[PDB]
Design a binder for these strands. Sequence first.
RNA 1: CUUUAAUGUUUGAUGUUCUAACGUUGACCCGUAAUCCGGGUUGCGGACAGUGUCUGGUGGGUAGUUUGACUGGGGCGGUCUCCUCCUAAAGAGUAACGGAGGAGCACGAAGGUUGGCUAAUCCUGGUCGGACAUCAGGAGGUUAGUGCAAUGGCAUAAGCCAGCUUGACUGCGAGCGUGACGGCGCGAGCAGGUGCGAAAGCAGGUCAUAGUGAUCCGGUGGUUCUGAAUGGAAGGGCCAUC
RNA 2: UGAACUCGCUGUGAAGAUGCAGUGUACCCGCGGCAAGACGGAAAGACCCCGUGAACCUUUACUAUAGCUUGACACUGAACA
RNA 3: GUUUAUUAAAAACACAGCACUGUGCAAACACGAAAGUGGACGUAUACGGUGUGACGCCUGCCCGGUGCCGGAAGGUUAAU
RNA 4: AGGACCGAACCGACUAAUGUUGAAAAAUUAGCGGAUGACUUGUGGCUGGGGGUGAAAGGCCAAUCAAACCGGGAGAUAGCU
RNA 5: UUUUGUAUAAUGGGUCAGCGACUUAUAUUCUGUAGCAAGGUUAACCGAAUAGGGGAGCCGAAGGGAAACCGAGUCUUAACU
Lengths: 64, 79, 50
Amino acid sequence: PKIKTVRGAAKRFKKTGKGGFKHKHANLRHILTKKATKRKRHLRPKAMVSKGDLGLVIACLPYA
Amino acid sequence: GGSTRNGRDSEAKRLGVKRFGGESVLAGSIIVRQRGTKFHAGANVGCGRDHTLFAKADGKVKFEVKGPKNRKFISIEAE
Amino acid sequence: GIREKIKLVSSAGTGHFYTTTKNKRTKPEKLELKKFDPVVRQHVIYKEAK
RNA sequence: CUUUAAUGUUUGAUGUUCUAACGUUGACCCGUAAUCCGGGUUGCGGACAGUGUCUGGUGGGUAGUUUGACUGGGGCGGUCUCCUCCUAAAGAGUAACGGAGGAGCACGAAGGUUGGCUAAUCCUGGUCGGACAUCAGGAGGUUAGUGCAAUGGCAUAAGCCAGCUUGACUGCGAGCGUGACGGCGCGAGCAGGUGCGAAAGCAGGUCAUAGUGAUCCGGUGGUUCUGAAUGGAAGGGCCAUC
RNA sequence: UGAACUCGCUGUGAAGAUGCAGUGUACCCGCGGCAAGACGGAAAGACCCCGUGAACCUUUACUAUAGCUUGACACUGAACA
RNA sequence: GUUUAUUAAAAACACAGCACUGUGCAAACACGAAAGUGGACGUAUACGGUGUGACGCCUGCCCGGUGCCGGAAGGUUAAU
RNA sequence: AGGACCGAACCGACUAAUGUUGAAAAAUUAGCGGAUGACUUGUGGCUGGGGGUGAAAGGCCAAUCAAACCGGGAGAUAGCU
RNA sequence: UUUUGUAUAAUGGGUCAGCGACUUAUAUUCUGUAGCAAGGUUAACCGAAUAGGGGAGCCGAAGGGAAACCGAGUCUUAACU
Ligand SMILES: [Mg+2]
Ligand SMILES: [Mg+2]
Ligand SMILES: [Mg+2]
Ligand SMILES: [Mg+2]
Ligand SMILES: [Mg+2]
Ligand SMILES: [Mg+2]
Ligand SMILES: [Mg+2]
Ligand SMILES: [Mg+2]
Ligand SMILES: [Mg+2]
Ligand SMILES: [Mg+2]
Ligand SMILES: [Mg+2]
Ligand SMILES: [Mg+2]
Ligand SMILES: [Mg+2]
Ligand SMILES: [Mg+2]
Ligand SMILES: [Mg+2]
Ligand SMILES: [Mg+2]
Ligand SMILES: [Mg+2]
Ligand SMILES: [Mg+2]
Ligand SMILES: [Mg+2]
Ligand SMILES: [Mg+2]
Ligand SMILES: [Mg+2]
Ligand SMILES: [Mg+2]
Ligand SMILES: [Mg+2]
Ligand SMILES: [Mg+2]
Ligand SMILES: [Mg+2]
Ligand SMILES: [Mg+2]
Ligand SMILES: [Mg+2]
Ligand SMILES: [Mg+2]
Ligand SMILES: [Mg+2]
Ligand SMILES: [Mg+2]
Ligand SMILES: [Mg+2]
Ligand SMILES: [Mg+2]
Ligand SMILES: [Mg+2]
Ligand SMILES: [Mg+2]
Ligand SMILES: [Mg+2]
Ligand SMILES: [Mg+2]
Ligand SMILES: [Mg+2]
Ligand SMILES: [Mg+2]
Ligand SMILES: [Mg+2]
Ligand SMILES: [Mg+2]
Ligand SMILES: [Mg+2]
Ligand SMILES: [Mg+2]
Ligand SMILES: [Mg+2]
Ligand SMILES: [Mg+2]
Ligand SMILES: [Mg+2]
């Protein structure tokens, strides 16, 4: 049968032009009063997935 | 009574001399938490809020001792 | 941890607000500050500090 | 035109009476040569009791499960996250149920800037006053001080006093340090607007290193991004925040 | 019951040797006896620990539930105060 | 008297007696989705459950906890 | 008269020895307890597994019982050998 | 065989013969090889049935953003050196 994608990761990761994956940073959901504005501003954008995690991401997302 | 409970990740002490990083302001060339015996020599930009020295643009890193009290400063030779 | 969290609301029509903390027993009087409002791009007064 | 009274009407509750629902493991007759069952007459009870749906309580009677790890064997005791020092062998890093201490905050000024100032301790003289309070002078030169444990710093002061202030700003950020990763940290410089100062300049919290909790789920405000035939709305997304 | 041409002592050795080192002794093969050894034979130790094992039992462990029990509606009607 | 058929025959179980408690008969209680059956073709001098265990002398104090029984006050409280 | 006494049949199983690849998957020999009673025995019948029965030992339910046996889910699962 | 380590007195094997353990299906990524070349390829099905038809579809040639949307650019920002 077909491989069933991990729906948990399908809505966590998105594929880029050169095969990479973009994701949203953590630590930006709650308890934000004591966090520095510099830290929150740096977290606000989106980052790429590291080398060590690409294997797991690709395993989770076969049809991405 | 009581043991273990030791702090972790004491960071770093020395990050280079001369044209080791060179490019841009860098973030090394300092013993963090030190201040004493590692001051800004004017050539490199002053300390950070946590007493971290860094360069201006480029150049070699040098250490000298001058001024009263014989304090050691880090300068950078612009090139 | 008696210190509690309050929000400073811009006096302008914009809904922008800051957040901070203050002691309730020591200074119960309202806190008034002048901060930058990114929506109107001007420094304005802020209120609503229990 | 009423903060006020009363024939009548409606609708609830309580208590008596009734009988026609319903009960009868009371009596008698028939099916019927039958202590079942059914039908009939009668007596008693009676809108109770009892059953169906919903609902609060109780419920080891029954059922499915859980009841952590390290550990000089297990158990008892102790510990599990973060910060400082030694062990740690003059770059970084480095273990033990190794040796010693702290943290789970505080501040609307204890932040910014401008201006100014310099300690502990001892000695000599002097009312209460003395071992020690305050005053004058002289030694001394940081043995003082830091919002808080330790280390490293600090006279230029990061230590002490005063004036004005909110940069404890918003969007970015070349470059770098430290991590397997999640992530954490330093950062010149650019744009907008602001404070102190004559100006050069300084300010993106506090002398620095502890004061902390991912994701999911949901709450509050803004938005003109989406809106399942169309127009709206609900819900969702994005920004701030709990 | 891996196969044996299957001695003693001292030492060595995965740490208690018939098989290793040194050394001593010992012609080949039966029969009757004894049980010191072959860590002898049997039972994948029952003691101890481990497995994010099982099964029963207990209770003011958690979550359910039969049973019991309270009320509303229905079966369920009529008069009077 | 009974007991671990096959390592335990006993101080263990039972026992007659004693006490508490429930039960008014379509009894309580038990088996059973229900019908129905036992209790019992019995009726409180009866039946069920619990503890103790011939007989003799006796069986003291505590109702704060848990349980059980009773209580037209008041507080809280489901469905609707 | 007696849940009276001694003691055969009969029903039990307290001690010792033997046996322990047995004559026997609990028996033999010598002793031992009850033996008119809550006794013992033949035939037939009823109670069925989270159930039965139990003078209670977690005992018995066809040499098997802290949940019988047979078939199926089923190639249960096994970070273990 | 398992171990830091076994002649080990740690496990398994009395011997012989026969049987006995990395497979199959469908998806997805990579390597080799063959065809075609901005294109490649058909599935069901039809069929004189391994031909031929069938292009429904699927992958690739364009990305950015949560999205509207824009597009060799796009996102962030009032806007970016
Ligand atoms: Mg959010
Ligand atoms: Mg249970
Ligand atoms: Mg289960
Ligand atoms: Mg369990
Ligand atoms: Mg353990
Ligand atoms: Mg121990
Ligand atoms: Mg070192
Ligand atoms: Mg070294
Ligand atoms: Mg190492
Ligand atoms: Mg301060
Ligand atoms: Mg100054
Ligand atoms: Mg200051
Ligand atoms: Mg500090
Ligand atoms: Mg619509
Ligand atoms: Mg919304
Ligand atoms: Mg020997
Ligand atoms: Mg030896
Ligand atoms: Mg012989
Ligand atoms: Mg012998
Ligand atoms: Mg041997
Ligand atoms: Mg043996
Ligand atoms: Mg074993
Ligand atoms: Mg007797
Ligand atoms: Mg017997
Ligand atoms: Mg009856
Ligand atoms: Mg007794
Ligand atoms: Mg007694
Ligand atoms: Mg007799
Ligand atoms: Mg006799
Ligand atoms: Mg016996
Ligand atoms: Mg005999
Ligand atoms: Mg006798
Ligand atoms: Mg027992
Ligand atoms: Mg049996
Ligand atoms: Mg079971
Ligand atoms: Mg199955
Ligand atoms: Mg199997
Ligand atoms: Mg394991
Ligand atoms: Mg070993
Ligand atoms: Mg060897
Ligand atoms: Mg050995
Ligand atoms: Mg061997
Ligand atoms: Mg083994
Ligand atoms: Mg063997
Ligand atoms: Mg696209």
